[PDB]
Design a protein around this ligand. Structure first.
Ligand SMILES: [K+]
Ligand SMILES: [K+]
Ligand SMILES: [K+]
Ligand SMILES: [K+]
Ligand SMILES: [K+]
Ligand SMILES: [K+]
Ligand SMILES: [K+]
Ligand SMILES: [K+]
Ligand SMILES: [K+]
Ligand SMILES: [K+]
Ligand SMILES: [K+]
Ligand SMILES: [Mg+2]
Ligand SMILES: [Mg+2]
Ligand SMILES: [Mg+2]
Ligand SMILES: [Mg+2]
Ligand SMILES: [Mg+2]
Ligand SMILES: [Mg+2]
Ligand SMILES: [Mg+2]
Ligand SMILES: [Mg+2]
Ligand SMILES: [Mg+2]
Ligand SMILES: [Mg+2]
Ligand SMILES: [Mg+2]
Ligand SMILES: [Mg+2]
Ligand SMILES: [Mg+2]
Ligand SMILES: [Mg+2]
Ligand SMILES: [Mg+2]
Ligand SMILES: [Mg+2]
Ligand SMILES: [Mg+2]
Ligand SMILES: [Mg+2]
Ligand SMILES: [Mg+2]
Ligand SMILES: [Mg+2]
Ligand SMILES: [Mg+2]
Ligand SMILES: [Mg+2]
Ligand SMILES: [Mg+2]
Ligand SMILES: [Mg+2]
Ligand SMILES: [Mg+2]
Ligand SMILES: [Mg+2]
Ligand SMILES: [Mg+2]
Ligand SMILES: [Mg+2]
Ligand SMILES: [Mg+2]
Ligand SMILES: [Mg+2]
Ligand SMILES: [Mg+2]
Ligand SMILES: [Mg+2]
Ligand SMILES: [Mg+2]
Ligand SMILES: [Mg+2]
Ligand SMILES: [Mg+2]
Ligand SMILES: [Mg+2]
Ligand SMILES: [Mg+2]
Ligand SMILES: [Mg+2]
Ligand SMILES: [Mg+2]
Ligand SMILES: [Mg+2]
Ligand SMILES: [Mg+2]
Ligand SMILES: [Mg+2]
Ligand SMILES: [Mg+2]
Ligand SMILES: [Mg+2]
Ligand SMILES: [Mg+2]
Ligand SMILES: [Mg+2]
Ligand SMILES: [Mg+2]
Ligand SMILES: [Mg+2]
Ligand SMILES: [Mg+2]
Ligand SMILES: [Mg+2]
Ligand SMILES: [Mg+2]
Ligand code: NA
Ligand code: NA
Ligand code: NA
Ligand code: NA
Lengths: 141, 64, 114, 156
RNA sequence: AAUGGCACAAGGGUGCUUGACUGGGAGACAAACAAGUCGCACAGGUAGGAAACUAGAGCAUAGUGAUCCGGUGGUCCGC
RNA sequence: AUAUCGGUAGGGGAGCAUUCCAGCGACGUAGAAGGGAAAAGGGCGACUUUUUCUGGAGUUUCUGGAAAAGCAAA
RNA sequence: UGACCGAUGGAGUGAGGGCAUGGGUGCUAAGGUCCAUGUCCGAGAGGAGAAGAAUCCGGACCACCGGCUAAGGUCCCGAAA
RNA sequence: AGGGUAGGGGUGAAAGGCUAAUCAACUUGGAGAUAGCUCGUACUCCCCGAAAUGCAUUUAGGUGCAGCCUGUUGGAUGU
RNA sequence: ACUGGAAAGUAUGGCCGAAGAGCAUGAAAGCUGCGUAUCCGACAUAUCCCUGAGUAGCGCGGGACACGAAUCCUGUGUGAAUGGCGGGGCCCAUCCCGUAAGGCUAAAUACUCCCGAGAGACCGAUAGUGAACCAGUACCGUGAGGGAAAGGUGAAAAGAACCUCGAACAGAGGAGUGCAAUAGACCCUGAACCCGUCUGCCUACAAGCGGUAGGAGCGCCAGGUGUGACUGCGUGCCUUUUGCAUAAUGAACCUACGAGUUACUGUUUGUGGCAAGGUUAAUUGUUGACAAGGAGCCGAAGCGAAAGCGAGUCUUAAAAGGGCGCAGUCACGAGCAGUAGACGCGAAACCAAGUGAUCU
RNA sequence: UAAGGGCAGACGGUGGAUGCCUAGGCUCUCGGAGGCGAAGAAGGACGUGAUAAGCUGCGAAAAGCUGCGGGAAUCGGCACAUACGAAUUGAUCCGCAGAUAUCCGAAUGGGGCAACCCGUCAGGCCCCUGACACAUGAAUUUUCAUGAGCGAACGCGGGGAACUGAAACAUCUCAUUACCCGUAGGAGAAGAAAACAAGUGAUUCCCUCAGUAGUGGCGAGCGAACGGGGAU
């Protein structure tokens, strides 16, 4: 093609909807609005959370809980991912192949079966047991 | 401008892993005694938002 | 950019005004009166295309009745005899023969007048 | 309506005049009134992914190469700006009949001045190649160093 | 109150008692939503009884009404 | 192949015309646009072609793009 | 038959009415009023009843100067004894 | 003839009279106030096609959610 | 050379190009004019030991801070210290940070009455500024104030000597100019509503939305066209309604004008690019384009109010006894939503600053 | 018989649609500049031409006067004009610098119904004239500089609504908005820790953090900062 025979992909573009332009279009007259009432007027909007005067659900259910402003959240890395990284080094925590300046926690999802030297901020008990069974090392910092 | 979150909704609702909305149970009568000890149904277990009432809590929490 | 379709807008009216020729008074040339008259005529034309078949069948039946009563029979008796003898000549052909080919109509009548 | 120059005074009283009820003079129903939903100043820029744009550039270059409208000439310099010299080069390369795009590796002030006045010719650096500029011209003339620059910069 | 039930009584007496329990809800009824109704299994330890068994209040259906903000008794987070 | 195809509110699909833009093709004082008359055409339609008179200088096809993008009643 | 059910995008409606049946109310009145079960008008053209929203027959893709029927009809206006 | 009292302010031998043909003032601006109300809403062809009920409501000619329509889908059962 | 009133048009054939931007010229010009690329040019005139007292702090009443009672401010009443004092969200202690009651300070930021150079998938005379022209004019009002309509002969005025009718150019018919005067001053083009003349056919026994379907005769230019005796059927349209010929609403008619738009943020979907990853924002370089910018955002683990544990977790003394869990991302187009006047016209009113006692 | 009427065609009238055209608007970009005025402003009045001036220009020296530089044949402004003159001894025109510049207006000698009336003192002419001076407030020492008024937006400061939303309404919102008033500069304001925080290191602005922390008849709503990346 060139600039004189441009073509988009089939179904990529579509004409917009135009209302109030006659009977043949199927969208004239009342222009998809119905007949009367509040919803047919210019400038109508929905009051969000308004149910006609009944007590709304966000007011009749109770508030619960509190959030911790000093919350430590780790990033879950599993043993199967650790194996995948190990298969094309031994000393792990390279993190350049994945997080970006965060705390990491090793969890037990697959298996290791290979001697690693995994270093991470925190570990699971099953993770440490699996590393020991595979004949590896755990460094926690 | 960006859509604003409803403050009461953000204090009353939470999201789960599958995208379901969980909530606390309001009592029928909040004066315990003269109500059967089976009030653990509304006193111990978090429930979910009914599918019919859904999309309203979503719009309250900015369709999240 | 600013788009106004002056020529197309006027041509649409002029085409319909060409069809409203011959009407009475304002109905021939005054746009909102002429357009109103034209569409009612179109509904009339739709109904009249249906009623034309009824009218022409009634005319054929009346002419056949006259010719058969000349021959000494009524329309209903002649049609009963024709259907019993199983000939498939339709009312338009029978009326055309009755008005223009009386010898052929006489032949048809004599075949079934047994 | 809010930026017309007429006053906001009600033109006629609400009831009793016998005509249509009227507000202020800036109404769109009145001759010389407001322009409803007219144009507003706009920014028409939109975003395409970098990989999408690179793929489009490669697609345009491949279209040219497949349709056999790419020819490679030696690098040349002009001692003085000479439109006749550039025209002679174009006629020798047989790209004077239609639109042609030259791809150069460097500035080449004299060459640019020589090519400035010719109708169906365009000049562009190799590192500034874009899909529209490639597709706009019938023929594409690369130089020896332009081939190397395009190969090293727009590869993969 | 009315309706339905009730003799192996769910009606009336004595004796002993605290199950007017803790942790609970396979499964259903009903229902715009909010609310509502019946009911586990098993474990801990009891009451009655020779045992079997029964007891998570009352023959059943009315006897209240959210959220927010406050009070009281127990038991994780703030600077 | 069979079946189906009345429709208000309303949902869905496919298109015509208008103004400007890019690319590619064209037309015009041997007569452009506009105005009058006539003729033909379209699964169907919005509309499109052709001839002639007036007119006396601009217009148009195809593909894609963008909207001050269509009136009978307030 | 085919559209029943799930999940999702978009709605409109939330003034109904007539007839038949079972009832309440009224006066065993109302083209009255309030419910239930069907149906039609609403949103439905065509035929008969002189002329009638919902009574009887019947659901209109377009064309035809072809044929058969439904309700109801066949002395003339007006098709057919 | 000249002067003074200015907006619910003045003035009123009191009628809520008069205050520039305006009185339970005028001009400009906030301002395109608000109007759950009335009216109006423009090219074409094709396919499908309702509701006028329930619950709640300072609600009753408004609205929320169900019920009934439509588009795309995945299961299958609906009559 | 051709056409033309007139070539810049067409067709040949040449030439310049650091100049093929443009405007004008009797039609559309690289080579006719002014210009353009490029180079050159200014007599002046401008511009470049000491250490902040009615202080810190405090009581009462208020205010600003995102905050509707920690920090900062103060109307009222009080009132120190010289390592001390202040702050880290009520209050105390430890710790950490800082050094009030004195002052000045460029850059990166906001805006356009004005001057200069440019641009537009902006308008083209009911549009675009109210104002293309005599425009804040005419007109209206005591006043503050409100506030229009109105562009186009022709290339060139060559803007019609003279004649005829007529009292007169009032107007016209000629002559003449001109490509054209049916371009003649209101002058390009010259539509509709509305108003006439001529020609053809019909019409004075006939009765309802004015058409529609049949159908003689007459009349024109070879199968088309005008009219139409006579026959059948037919209570306009919009809106609003359970239901409208309705005696419910609405319009004198024509031409022109007139009402779901745009921005941002979500969400769903059609089509695409990458893919366990996806994508840059502000901004920065080289010349709108290429290249750089990884800050940030989503995804990649969940459960629990939380500490926390983790393909588990919560409840429990303990139990699956119960609850919740065991391919994305970035765009382009389209639907919908919210926030902005948000489909258009329409109140009665409320508030602020002014103008009026020339009437009464 | 058509008095009249109906339909069609042709040709006219009226009217000014449409098409084509236009420097008159609209929105911006880049670079400058960001004031004028008591040495009298903005804005006006009255004049000024060979022929009345409606605009334009100018000011009793009045479509104009002088010098220097540029330049070379027409010129004497425009609303469809003739006359009469100027000009190669260099007009007209363009750039820079000068001269003149009536009256009102902050208006400033005193008044006043703006564009007018009435004065005093020093001189000069000659009851009347032309030319001087004669205001007020603040630094100031009666000598001196400065100020007053006007004017686009942007800045800072002093006062400060209501309609509206919350489906009523009073806390709340609209909004420290509209509006009134005062006062700068080319920008203004801010700015060098009795700071944030749980190591950074003065202000200002942009992108994020984030519709998050908070706040709120915990309703409608409102809504940061730390940190990170930049401009400087
Ligand atoms: K008992
Ligand atoms: K009858
Ligand atoms: K008959
Ligand atoms: K030229
Ligand atoms: K002409
Ligand atoms: K012309
Ligand atoms: K005419
Ligand atoms: K007729
Ligand atoms: K009426
Ligand atoms: K008086
Ligand atoms: K400063
Ligand atoms: Mg519809
Ligand atoms: Mg309509
Ligand atoms: Mg309506
Ligand atoms: Mg209604
Ligand atoms: Mg509605
Ligand atoms: Mg409104
Ligand atoms: Mg009309
Ligand atoms: Mg106003
Ligand atoms: Mg306008
Ligand atoms: Mg529009
Ligand atoms: Mg339930
Ligand atoms: Mg059908
Ligand atoms: Mg249909
Ligand atoms: Mg011609
Ligand atoms: Mg055009
Ligand atoms: Mg197109
Ligand atoms: Mg329009
Ligand atoms: Mg129109
Ligand atoms: Mg209702
Ligand atoms: Mg109802
Ligand atoms: Mg009734
Ligand atoms: Mg009855
Ligand atoms: Mg209806
Ligand atoms: Mg029906
Ligand atoms: Mg019928
Ligand atoms: Mg039969
Ligand atoms: Mg009274
Ligand atoms: Mg009066
Ligand atoms: Mg407002
Ligand atoms: Mg209004
Ligand atoms: Mg159907
Ligand atoms: Mg609904
Ligand atoms: Mg010739
Ligand atoms: Mg011409
Ligand atoms: Mg105008
Ligand atoms: Mg006379
Ligand atoms: Mg002519
Ligand atoms: Mg004309
Ligand atoms: Mg008679
Ligand atoms: Mg007769
Ligand atoms: Mg009624
Ligand atoms: Mg009727
Ligand atoms: Mg009405
Ligand atoms: Mg009327
Ligand atoms: Mg009517
Ligand atoms: Mg009208
Ligand atoms: Mg005419
Ligand atoms: Mg003098
Ligand atoms: Mg000189
Ligand atoms: Mg004075
Ligand atoms: Mg309110
Ligand atoms: Na559609
Ligand atoms: Na009074
Ligand atoms: Na006549
Ligand atoms: Na004076």
């Amino acid at each position: 093609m060139n600039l004189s025979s441009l073509k988009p992909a089939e179904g990529a573009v579509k004409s917009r909807k135009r209302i109030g332009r006659g009977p043949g279009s199927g969208l004239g007259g009342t222009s998809t609005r119905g007949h009367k009432g509040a919803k047919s007027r210019s400038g109508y909007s929905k009051k969000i959370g308004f149910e006609g005067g009944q007590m709304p659900i966000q007011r009749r259910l109770p508030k619960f809980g509190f959030k911790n402003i000093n919350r430590v959240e780790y990033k879950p890395i599993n043993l199967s991912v650790l194996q995948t990284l190990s298969e094309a080094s031994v000393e792990d925590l390279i993190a350049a192949g994945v997080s970006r300046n965060s705390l990491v926690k090793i969890l037990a999802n697959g298996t290791v079966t290979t001697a690693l030297t995994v270093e991470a901020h925190a570990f699971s008990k099953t993770a440490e047991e699996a590393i020991v069974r595979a004949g590896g090392s755990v460094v926690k910092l | 401008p960006k859509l604003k979150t409803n403050s009461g909704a953000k204090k009353r609702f939470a999201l789960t892993g599958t995208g379901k909305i969980k909530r606390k149970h309001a009592f029928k009568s909040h004066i315990l005694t003269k109500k059967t000890k089976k009030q653990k149904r509304n006193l111990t277990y978090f429930s979910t938002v009914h599918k019919v009432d859904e999309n309203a809590v979503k719009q309250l929490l900015c369709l999240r | 950019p600013r788009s106004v379709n002056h020529v197309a807008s006027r041509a649409k009216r002029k085409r319909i005004l060409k069809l409203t020729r011959g009407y009475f008074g304002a109905r021939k040339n005054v746009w909102t009166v002429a357009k109103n008259t034209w569409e009612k005529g179109l509904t009339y034309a739709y109904r009249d295309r249906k009623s034309k078949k009824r009218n022409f069948r009634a005319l054929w039946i009346q002419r056949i009745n006259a010719a058969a009563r000349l021959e000494g029979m009524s329309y209903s008796r002649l049609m009963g005899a024709l259907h019993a003898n199983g000939i498939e000549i339709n009312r338009k052909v029978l009326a055309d023969l009755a008005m223009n080919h009386p010898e052929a109509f006489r032949a048809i009548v004599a075949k079934v007048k047994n | 309506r809010s930026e017309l120059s007429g006053s906001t005074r009600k033109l006629i009283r609400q009831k009793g005049s016998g005509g249509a009820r009227r507000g202020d003079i800036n109404s769109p129903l009145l001759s010389g009134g407001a322009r409803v939903f007219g144009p507003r100043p706009r920014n028409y820029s939109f975003k395409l992914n970098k990989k999408l744009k690179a793929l489009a550039r490669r697609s345009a270059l491949s279209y040219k190469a497949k349709n056999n409208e790419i020819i490679v000439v030696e690098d040349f310099n002009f001692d003085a700006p000479k439109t006749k010299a550039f025209k002679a080069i174009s006629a020798a390369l047989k790209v004077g009949e239609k639109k042609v795009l030259y791809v150069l590796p460097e500035v080449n002030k004299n060459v640019y001045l020589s090519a400035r006045n010719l109708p169906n010719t365009n000049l562009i650096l190799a590192n500034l190649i874009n899909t529209y500029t490639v597709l706009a011209s019938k023929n594409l003339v690369l130089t020896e160093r332009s081939v190397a620059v395009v190969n090293e910069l727009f590869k993969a």
